[PDB]
Amino acid sequence: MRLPSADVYRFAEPDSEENIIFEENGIPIIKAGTVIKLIERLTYHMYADPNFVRTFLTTYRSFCKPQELLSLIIERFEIPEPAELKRFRKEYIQPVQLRVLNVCRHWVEHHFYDFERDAYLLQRMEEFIGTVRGKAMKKWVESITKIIQRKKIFQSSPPTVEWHISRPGHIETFDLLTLHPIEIARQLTLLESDLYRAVQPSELVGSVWTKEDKEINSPNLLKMIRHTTNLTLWFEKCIVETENLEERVAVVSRIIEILQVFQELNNFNGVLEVVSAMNSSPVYRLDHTFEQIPSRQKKILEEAHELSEDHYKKYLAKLRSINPPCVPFFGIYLTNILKTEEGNPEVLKRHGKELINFSKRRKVAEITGEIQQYQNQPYCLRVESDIKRFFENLNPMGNSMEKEFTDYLFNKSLEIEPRPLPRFPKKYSYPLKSPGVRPSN
């Protein structure tokens, strides 16, 4: 064809080695390229590219500010002309404008948080929408405006809740041994799956949960990790604060049973809560407690701990092998995102020109996507609001700081099993026999 002069239209300028680079192997994959040439292929006239659009929109603020993005796509939209110009308005002016509008579609639809944060950004968007013309254009863009006005505001019945020493309603009696182990693992899996689902890629992209404004940008992620940390700490605290060896063997056993049910529900965050508790300094050393622990449950806990070993080779294998719903362990995702960003260049230099490294951003987007796949399917399980609120309001650390508390735990480990073994009196008046992890009927 034939395009404007690259002096009233920056995108008109053509591909070159100083402009775009691709991969190997359909529609060709961008290795890297100037931001101009990225907005170009993002609204290319020869083909639509919904995949590249989703990916670009997920991962762009690490090289383009949202305001710059709007300015660039508007500059792309307003095209100069070079009567045989029918080919142009037919094979350029019209599909290019399609793609530009259809990128505003996606940006406004899935990524509306850019406009809630910057109000004048939304104002520029609404202006640009309201300057589109052509009787067909108006009817197409009408729906794009609908979206903006919108955002500006089973098989069988799930199994019966299980009860133990504590009866429904008696919240005062709730505790690790008086609730039913199955229902404990159930309701914790409900909390942990919700906490998981709620994590939004805007919090993971940019390694943004590791930086000084992490409390602002990644509140869902931090709330989930603090749940997991809290649960491991409550487990440790239940163990070492049970000074009687008989009662403490009951406690460690019930916790391994909870671990089994976590394994069944494919709640891997839940599995690693208990695994990390068992690995902690205060608990690891209680040889007298693990002595009286039956070998069935020792193989349970061994198989669970196996998963973490060799950089989780086995957890990754099992997470592959099984079928949703599940709760993955999030820290591996966090490390892979961080190391992909910090471990690959922001830019590639060709011919003394700087080219945004895009396949790094694509590698990020793949991991966020793999996260969001496990967020779709939910759990066939009845919510028990009271057990749930019990585990929400757990605070094993009290008013103590981290070190003060981990020290208290270790010092209790030495109190209860020194480096003779003393004898401590019983603390639980109710019986200590697990009803087991096989359900009722």
Partner: protein
């Protein structure tokens, strides 16, 4: 042959991941894919003897604090990393070492103190003194020129070998 299981401990948000990455980034290459095996298991010659380094860097999981023990339990040698232009990442070092010692149940675990290089706020003599108080070595590394990276890791290997 022989393979050493090393662990990296340090405060987040000051790019401690740059340490292991630079060691393994086979130099003049950048295409780092953290998901595969070569990304964290180099093999090296050290004082004539050949071995394989297995380097655990949980960068990004700092808020999973009750997971530190477990992680640390897996290592026979530790790099305690701080950022030489971030003083708090340096004061974190003492508690980190306390945790390592408690976990491994010894008072001298093979470990080295590495400070990673914005404007410096931890003078070299400070961290030199701090390393001497522990009986462990000190290595400064550049996060942009690979200087000291190999030095740091080989030093920890030698610490394990003279234990």
């Amino acid at each position: 042959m022989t393979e050493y299981k090393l662990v990296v401990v340090g405060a987040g948000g000051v790019g401690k991941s740059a340490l292991t990455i630079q060691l393994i980034q086979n130099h003049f290459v950048d295409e780092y894919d953290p998901t595969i095996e070569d990304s964290y298991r180099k093999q090296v010659v050290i004082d004539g003897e050949t071995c394989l380094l297995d380097i655990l860097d949980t960068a990004g999981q700092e808020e999973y604090s009750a997971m530190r023990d477990q992680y640390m339990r897996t290592g026979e040698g530790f790099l305690c990393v701080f950022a030489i232009n971030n003083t708090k990442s340096f004061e974190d070092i003492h508690q980190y070492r306390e945790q390592i010692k408690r976990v491994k149940d010894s008072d001298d675990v093979p470990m080295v103190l590495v400070g990673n290089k914005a404007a410096r706020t931890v003078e070299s003599r400070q961290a030199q003194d701090l390393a001497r108080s522990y009986g462990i070595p000190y290595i400064e590394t550049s996060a942009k020129t690979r200087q000291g990276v190999e030095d740091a890791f080989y030093t920890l290997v030698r610490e394990i070998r003279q234990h």
